[PDB]
C-alpha cells in the first residue's frame, strides 16, 4: 500500500527532526524574540510511517494537519509556517547523551516547530532553546516530539 | 514478518508511555529520592515497530537492550528496572496542551524511564518530575522518549 | 472476543444534551480507535465522530462540529459521546464502534469490527 | 463534505450475482483499495463483511468479493439468497481526519 506522505500530517503524530550544523540564534521573531537552534539543512522524520525528506525539499505551502493547511506568521516580511507539538521539544546533541532544554523549561506550555520558506528550495527549521547549552555552533541536534492539535 | 516483540530495544527507538491515573511521588528511590509520577495501569509503545504491552504484562527480566539486560538498582528491597533514553523525557497532560517538565529542567543531563516489578503480574512506571505542574493526581500522562545507549 | 456494551435508551425533550456510554468489556482500549455512528428511522448510516485513546484528540464531522464531544477513559474501558442543543430529527439509534486498526497511525485504513447494542434518542415531548 | 454515492436500489434473481459502486469525488475520500462495507440486516446492528478492499473478516460467507477500479469501489454478492436482501454501505477515511459513510444500497429478490 502507499505510504502516508510527509507533507500530510496528522495529530498524534511522531515527528523526528535533524539539525546537521545548526546555529544558535539569540532571538527569533516566531518564538516573540527568544533564542532558537536553526539549521540549514534539516531532515524531518515521521517515525510511524517511516516517511523522510529534507526540509528544504517540501513545499510548505501544501502541508496540511488534520486536512488543513499549517498556521502562518509574517514576520519583518519573511513567512514562518507552524507545526505545533503535543509536549515540549526533545532535543540533544546527536551521539551524546548531552541533553538541551527549550526557553520555557519552566512553564507548562507546549512548544511548536517552525520553518521559514522562501517558495523554492530554502528553508530553515527552528527550535526553541533557553540558550548555548549544546554550543555556540555548528553542533549535530536531533529532536523528538509529538503533533499538536491545528491552532484555533 | 514476524513484529520485532516489545521486550527487545534498540539505541535510537522511540517509546511511547501512556500513564493512566498517575500520582505523584514527592521522592523516589531510583532517581535519587527525586519527585516522580508514576501509574499502576501503565502502557509502553514502540512506536516505529507498532508494538505494544502493558507494563504490568511485561517480565522485565527478560527485557534487553542492545541484546543485553537492563540495568537493575536493588533500592531499599525493591528492584527497579532502567530504560536509558537519548535527551529527556518529554510528558504532557494527556488530551491536553498542558506539558510537565522533569526535575533537571536546567541540567544537560538525559532521563531514564524506571519500572519496578514484583516478579508476577503488577509493574510500576516511573518518569521523573519536578513538581505537581500536573496536579496531585490522579491525572492521566502520555510520555514521549528516545532510547539511549546501554549503562556503562 | 472484545464486546462494546453501551447505555440504555433516553428521551430527552428538545434543546436538550444527551451522554451515550459505550463499555469496553473482554479487554482494554490499547491502541484501537472508538468512533459513533448514527441511524435515523428508516435512513442510512451518518459518521458523528471519533477519537484514538491514547492520543485524546478527538474530531468531528463538520454538521456536529461545536455540538458533539467525545471522550475515552482509561482507567474505566468506556467511552463517551455527547451531543448538545437536541433537535427533532436527532432522533436515532446511536453506535459505538470499535476502529480494529492495531496501529494508531495507519488509520486511513480501517474498519469497524464489533459494533455496539445501540443505543436509541428519542427527542420529542 | 459530499458523502459516497451509492446505487440506492440493486435487485437480481436467486442465484445471479449483483455489483454496488461507491463513487466519491474529491482526494478527500482517501484511496479506495482501502474501502470497507458492511451489511444491516432489518432490525439488526451493521456487521462488517469486506475490509481494506478485498479482505474478509472471519465467518463472512466466501460469495463476497471486493473490487477497485479508479475512483469507484464495487462491492460484489455471487449467489443470491434470501439472506442477502439487507443493506449495505461503504465506509472511507478522509483528508480530515473523518469517516464517511456510502447513501446505502438496498438489495431485493425478484
Known amino acids: 500500500a502507499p505510504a502516508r506522505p510527509i507533507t500530510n500530517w496528522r495529530s498524534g503524530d511522531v515527528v523526528w527532526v535533524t539539525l546537521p550544523s545548526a546555529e544558535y540564534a539569540q532571538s527569533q521573531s516566531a518564538m516573540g524574540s527568544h533564542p532558537a537552534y536553526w539549521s540549514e539543512e534539516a531532515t524531518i522524520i515521521n517515525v510511524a510511517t517511516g516517511q523522510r525528506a529534507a526540509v528544504s525539499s517540501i513545499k510548505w505551502d501544501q502541508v496540511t494537519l488534520n486536512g488543513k493547511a499549517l498556521h502562518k506568521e509574517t514576520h519583518s516580511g519573511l513567512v514562518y509556517y507552524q507545526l505545533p507539538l503535543m509536549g515540549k521539544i526533545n532535543f540533544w546533541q546527536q551521539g551524546t547523551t548531552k541533553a538541551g532544554y527549550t526557553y520555557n523549561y519552566n512553564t507548562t506550555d507546549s512548544d511548536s516547530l517552525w520553518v521559514w520558506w522562501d517558495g523554492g528550495s530554502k528553508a530553515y527549521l527552528y527550535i526553541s532553546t533557553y540558550t548555548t547549552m549544546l554550543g555556540a555552533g555548528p553542533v549535530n541536534i536531533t529532536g523528538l516530539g509529538a503533533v499538536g492539535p491545528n491552532p484555533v | 514478518a514476524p513484529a520485532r516483540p516489545i521486550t527487545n530495544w534498540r539505541s535510537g527507538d522511540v517509546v511511547w508511555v501512556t500513564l493512566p491515573s498517575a500520582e505523584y511521588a514527592q521522592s523516589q528511590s531510583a532517581m535519587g529520592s527525586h519527585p516522580a509520577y508514576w501509574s499502576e495501569e501503565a502502557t509502553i509503545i514502540n512506536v516505529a515497530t507498532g508494538q505494544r504491552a502493558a507494563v504490568s504484562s511485561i517480565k522485565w527480566d527478560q527485557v534487553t537492550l542492545n541484546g543485553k539486560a537492563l540495568h537493575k538498582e536493588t533500592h531499599s528491597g525493591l528492584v527497579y528496572y532502567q530504560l536509558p533514553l537519548m535527551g529527556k523525557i518529554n510528558f504532557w497532560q494527556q488530551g491536553t496542551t498542558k506539558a510537565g517538565y522533569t526535575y533537571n529542567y536546567n541540567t544537560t543531563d538525559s532521563d531514564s524511564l524506571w519500572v519496578w516489578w514484583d516478579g508476577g503480574s503488577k509493574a510500576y512506571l516511573y518518569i521523573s518530575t519536578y513538581t505537581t505542574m500536573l496536579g496531585a493526581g490522579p491525572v492521566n500522562i502520555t510520555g514521549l522518549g528516545a532510547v539511549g545507549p546501554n549503562p556503562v | 472476543q472484545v464486546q462494546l456494551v453501551q447505555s440504555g435508551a433516553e428521551v430527552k425533550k428538545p434543546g436538550s444534551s444527551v451522554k451515550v456510554s459505550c463499555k469496553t468489556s473482554?479487554?482494554?482500549?490499547?491502541?484501537?480507535?472508538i468512533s459513533w455512528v448514527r441511524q435515523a428511522p428508516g435512513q442510512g448510516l451518518e459518521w458523528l465522530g471519533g477519537?484514538?485513546?491514547?492520543?485524546?484528540?478527538?474530531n468531528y464531522a463538520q454538521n456536529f462540529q461545536g455540538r458533539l464531544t467525545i471522550t475515552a477513559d482509561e482507567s474505566t474501558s468506556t467511552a463517551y459521546m455527547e451531543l448538545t442543543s437536541l433537535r427533532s430529527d436527532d432522533t436515532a439509534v446511536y453506535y459505538c464502534?470499535?476502529?480494529?486498526?492495531?496501529?494508531?497511525?495507519?488509520?486511513?485504513?480501517?474498519?469497524?469490527?464489533?459494533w455496539g447494542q445501540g443505543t436509541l434518542v428519542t427527542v420529542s415531548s | 463534505q459530499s458523502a459516497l454515492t451509492q446505487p440506492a436500489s440493486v435487485s437480481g434473481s436467486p442465484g445471479q450475482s449483483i455489483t454496488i459502486s461507491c463513487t466519491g469525488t474529491?482526494?478527500?475520500?482517501?484511496?479506495?483499495?482501502?474501502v470497507s462495507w458492511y451489511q444491516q440486516q432489518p432490525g439488526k446492528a451493521p456487521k462488517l463483511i469486506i475490509y481494506?478492499?478485498?479482505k474478509r473478516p472471519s465467518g463472512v460467507s466466501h460469495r463476497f468479493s471486493g473490487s477497485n477500479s479508479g475512483n469507484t469501489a464495487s462491492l460484489t454478492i455471487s449467489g443470491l439468497q434470501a439472506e442477502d436482501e439487507a443493506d449495505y454501505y461503504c465506509?472511507?477515511?478522509?483528508?480530515?481526519?473523518?469517516?464517511?459513510f456510502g447513501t446505502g444500497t438496498k438489495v431485493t429478490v425478484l
Open positions: 477519537i484514538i485513546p491514547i492520543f485524546a484528540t478527538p
Open positions: 481494506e478492499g478485498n
Open positions: 465506509c472511507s477515511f478522509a483528508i480530515s481526519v473523518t469517516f464517511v
Open positions: 474529491s482526494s478527500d475520500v482517501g484511496s479506495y483499495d482501502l
Open positions: 473482554g479487554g482494554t482500549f490499547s491502541t484501537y480507535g
Open positions: 464502534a470499535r476502529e480494529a486498526q492495531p496501529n494508531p497511525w495507519f488509520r486511513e485504513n480501517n474498519r469497524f469490527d464489533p
